[PDB]
Amino acid sequence: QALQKYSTDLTARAREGKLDPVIGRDNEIRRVVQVLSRRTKNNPVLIGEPGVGKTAIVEGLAQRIVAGDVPESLRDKTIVALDLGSMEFEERLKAVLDDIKNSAGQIITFIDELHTIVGMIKPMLARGELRLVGATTLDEYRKHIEKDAALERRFQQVYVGEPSVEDTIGILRGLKDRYEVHHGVRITDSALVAAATLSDRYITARFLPDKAIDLVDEAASRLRMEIDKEEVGPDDIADVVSAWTGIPAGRLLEGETAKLLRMEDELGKRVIGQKAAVTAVSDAVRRSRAGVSDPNRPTGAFMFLGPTGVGKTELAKALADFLFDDERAMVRIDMSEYGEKHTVARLIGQLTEAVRRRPYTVVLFDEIEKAHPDVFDVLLQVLDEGRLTDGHGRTVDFRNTILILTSNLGSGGSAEQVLAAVRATFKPEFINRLDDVLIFEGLNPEELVRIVDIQLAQLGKRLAQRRLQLQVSLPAKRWLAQRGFDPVYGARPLRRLVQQAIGDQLAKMLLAGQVHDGDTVPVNVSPDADSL
Amino acid sequence: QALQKYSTDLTARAREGKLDPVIGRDNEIRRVVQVLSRRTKNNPVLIGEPGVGKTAIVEGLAQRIVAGDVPESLRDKTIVALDLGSMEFEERLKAVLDDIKNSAGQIITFIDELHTIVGMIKPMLARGELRLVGATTLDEYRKHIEKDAALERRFQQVYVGEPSVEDTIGILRGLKDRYEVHHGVRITDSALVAAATLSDRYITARFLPDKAIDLVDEAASRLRMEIDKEEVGPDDIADVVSAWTGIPAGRLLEGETAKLLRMEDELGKRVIGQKAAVTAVSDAVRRSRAGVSDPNRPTGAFMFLGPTGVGKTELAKALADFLFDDERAMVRIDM
């Protein structure tokens, strides 16, 4: 009788249909019924990454008990959900345990989020009297419970993994009716495919099904606001995923075959030349979207190097541009700081807990020369297996990210002077695990004019606040090429040449008068410098 | 009936015109109406740096409800502002919650400054019965609420950012009539541009619109003192921003193209020579006031070095002299 005062009653709420219907997952329900009906030590624990549905399994168990699909010795045993917040203390707990044990096993207790239970129940668990069902996250478990190894021997870990898209479409078709009643709007199953398809290539921070329910909910709310078009559709889902995450401007809907047909030429609008090392980067993407890729390997793990000032960092930020519609959603770590043997621990982690959220980001590794040859040992099982560990004991899978390695070794080797210098620092067990080692060339003064066009278009887009168009003639536009010189420092001194020629006198003539908004500022070739 | 004794009633004060008119910000009002009318977990939280107007949004919502521009299932639902200072304790709180739940959702509760609520409402929030609107500062939130992550899952963060000058001019044109009645003086819209323009390059400690209302208020008060010139103007605004912060003496009126035309030669009255390294410092200021600067970069980040005893610290205190009219308003850290 004392459990009336310190508990809810899920069976009493289930007997009036006040629970959301649980669709899917026969295996976990059968596993819970298998574990909960053994003789001794009969108390499972649900464990998984958050959001995949763990309360939903216990509510589905309550639905299946009240329906009656269970075996014989599980029928009509109410699930009394306990508390520890609402609950002299030791007297109260002993009264609760005495009231449970006084019954004939007719009660299944349910402590949700039992990682707070650490802060006298220990002999009662192992004898087998009180049946206990729980739910933890995977990473509060190893911090609060696995520290206390006397307790955790008396449980049964039931892992729950996230589904794929194909089951989520069925879940969304199941739960369609509940939101149409609360918000008085109709929902079309044409949009219900897109709200799960499009929520995987864009929102890569949370886990699955709960993320693909917030879109339907917020779209229905926006439609109720507009009805303050009588049904939702595939456009308002895109409106929500634009206005949140600001992805609308970043590649408004993409990922078709019309795109991937033009990728060697679409990427050329920001990288000029280097043609033999775009036809290979443009190939590990097409063969991974056709389904020919090796299912236990990263989709592409290749290392390109060469002289400086060539475009080897600009390329690895340009192929992260149409995959993500942004340029800051990539894992950019810099190994120019790991000179000693004990900076392994900052990524084993800073590398780890930025992938496990959204397992699709491209990863940089800038200037891998300066790392001591101990960081390569950490990197060795990243390649060719795809998994590493950390303190909590989880094996994070790098099976579908695009690793990219940069270097500057040799920097001017003829044909094999640059290639045999790689063999000095890298042990042959690391050169073997890579893909095709790409060499960038220098730059040709024939292919150096168009970089000036790109730079001046960039400076034109910088002055969009002032609406300040500027006119550049072709003799000046080829005058800037000839000071682009001395192929040791690459195209980088051109981007100081532009700010020494145009930007100085423009910045002086901008803040003293005679240049205002909407005006046109032409440049003209004075016999040495550039005039205004 | 118990809410009569532990609450105010903003709707009852709004029904006699006793609230200052709320002008601007359609987006936040539409966002609050969107969040407050969902099915479950329907309780927003307004969050922003202080002074940008967060009570003003809830008072604008009350104005828009009493007017009637809302949708159908938000009409005639009074906003009863609760308290926790004026409020045996658990009995009293359960009486309040029972009185709220006894209605049919006809009441929108309003706990202002809800970061004191930590020190039994937890099941009532997630079911969706009591509608709750709040307002925290951005930096008391992460100290009092984000420590207690079971609570903060049941809210909806609605960020509110400060406006620019262009909307503040409209706000000041809106609220011009209210101070002309309390202080019996006229206010000229010529000065009303300057009281927002000049309050951005000088007073850089508080945030926006509330800072540009104190100048109009204290200027009207000084003019009432002198009438103990029949209207305020662009001079007394400058008098206030002189007498407070002592900026009046430090450059009487800062800004213009006549100034920035002479900056390589005006700066030479305190630094002699070094001519090739004043024509570059005098360039990151002119190109940043013309609008050619890169909008995501500091306007100038340059490093100068050399031998000792040359003037490399005297220069960096001389270009902080005509921008600020002082020489001590700079962030001088020493590494």
Distance of CA B157 to the CA centre of its chain: 18
Closest residue of chain A to B36, computed from CA coordinates? A221
Taking CA atoms, A412 is separated from A16, A274, A282, A483, in Å, by 78, 16, 26, 22
Contact between residue A133 and residue A178 where contact means Cβ atoms under 8 Å apart = no
CB contact under 8 A, A508 and B72: no
Residue B70 to chain A, least CA–CA distance (Å): 8
Phi, psi of A157 (to 5 degrees): -75, 120
Task: Using DSSP, state whether B282 is helix, strand or coil.
Answer: coil
The tokens for B156 are 């909806």
- Give long-range contacts, CB 8 A cutoff, 24+ apart: A98-106: A99/A1, A99/A2, A99/A3, A100/A3, A100/A129, A100/A130, A101/A129, A101/A130, A105/A77, A105/A129, A105/A131, A106/A76, A106/A77, A106/A78
CB distance from A430 to chain B under 8 Å? no
> Distance between CA B20 and CA B29 in Å, rounded?
16
- Determine contact, residues B113/B144, Cβ cutoff 8 Å: no
- Which residue among B38, B261, B288 places its CB closest to the CB of A221? B38
Q: Are strands A156-159 and A44-48 parallel, antiparallel or unpaired?
A: parallel
Residue A17 is part of a domain; what is its CATH number? 3.40.50.300
- CA nearest A422: which of A405, A402, A408, A404? A408
Cα separation, A93 vs A67, whole angstroms: 32
Kindly state the tokens that stand for B206: 């508080």
Residues in chain A within 8 Å Cβ distance of B285: 511
Question: To 5 degrees, how large is the angle CA A518–CA A522–CA A528?
Answer: 150
A483 touches chain B (CB under 8 A): no
Instruction: Look up residue A497 and give its two tokens.
Output: 């040449």
Contact residues, chain B, for A222 at CB < 8 Å: 34
Question: Rounded distance, CA B70 to CA B65, Å?
Answer: 6
* φ/ψ bin of A136: left (φ > 0), alpha (ψ from -120 to 50), beta (otherwise): beta
What residues form DSSP beta bridges with A281? none
User: Is B299 assigned to a binding site?
Assistant: no
Q: Is any Cβ of chain B less than 8 angstroms from the Cβ of A508?
A: yes
- Resolution, in Å, please? 6.3
Q: How far apart, in whole angstroms, are the C-alpha atoms of residue A466 and residue A463?
A: 6
Whether the CB of A507 is below 8 Å from some CB of chain B: the reply is yes
What is the DSSP secondary-structure string of A284-349? TTHHHHHT-S-SSS-SEEEEEE-SSSSSTTTTTTTTTTTTTSSSS-SEEEE-SS--STT-GGG---
* CA B25/CA B160 separation, integer angstroms: 10
**What is the domain extent for residue A74?**
7-159
Calculate how close chain B gets to A465, using CA atoms only, in Å: 7
* Nearest-by-CA chain B residue for A225: B34
Q: C-alpha B148: how far from its chain's center?
A: 28
B313 labelled ligand-binding: yes
d(CA B72, CA B37): 11
Which chain A residue shows the shortest CA-CA distance from B262?
Answer: A512
Q: CA-CA distances (angstroms) from residue A472 to A495, B135, B292?
A: 16, 53, 16
Burial of B193 (C-beta count, 10 Å sphere; 0-12/13-18/19+): middle
What amino acid occupies position A532?
A: L
Answer whether B34 touches A (CB < 8 Å): yes
Burial A220-252 (b: 16+ CB within 10 A, else e): bbbbbeeeeeeebebebbbebbbeebebbebbe
Name all contacts of A484-487 with Cβ < 8 Å and 24+ positions apart. Answer: A484/A445, A484/A448, A484/A451, A484/A452, A487/A442, A487/A443
Q: Give the residue among A163, A155, A164 at the shortest CA–CA distance from A136.
A: A155
Contact call for residues B108 and B77 (beta carbons, < 8 A): yes
- Among A470, A467, A462, residue whose Cα is nearest residue A502: A470
A515 lies within 8 A of chain B by CB: yes
Rg (CA), chain A: 31
Q: For residue B259, give how far its alpha carbon lies from the nearest alpha carbon of chain A (Å).
A: 8
Pick the closest to residue A194 from A165, A217, A229, A224 (CA basis): A165
Dihedral (C-alpha) A389, A391, A394, A399: value to the nearest 10 degrees? -30
Q: Look at B30 and A225 and tell me if their CB atoms are within 8 Å.
A: yes
Are A81 and A9 contacting, i.e. CB atoms less than 8 angstroms apart? yes
Å between A322 CA and nearest CA of chain B: 22
What six digits make up the tokens of B276? Answer: 């090739």
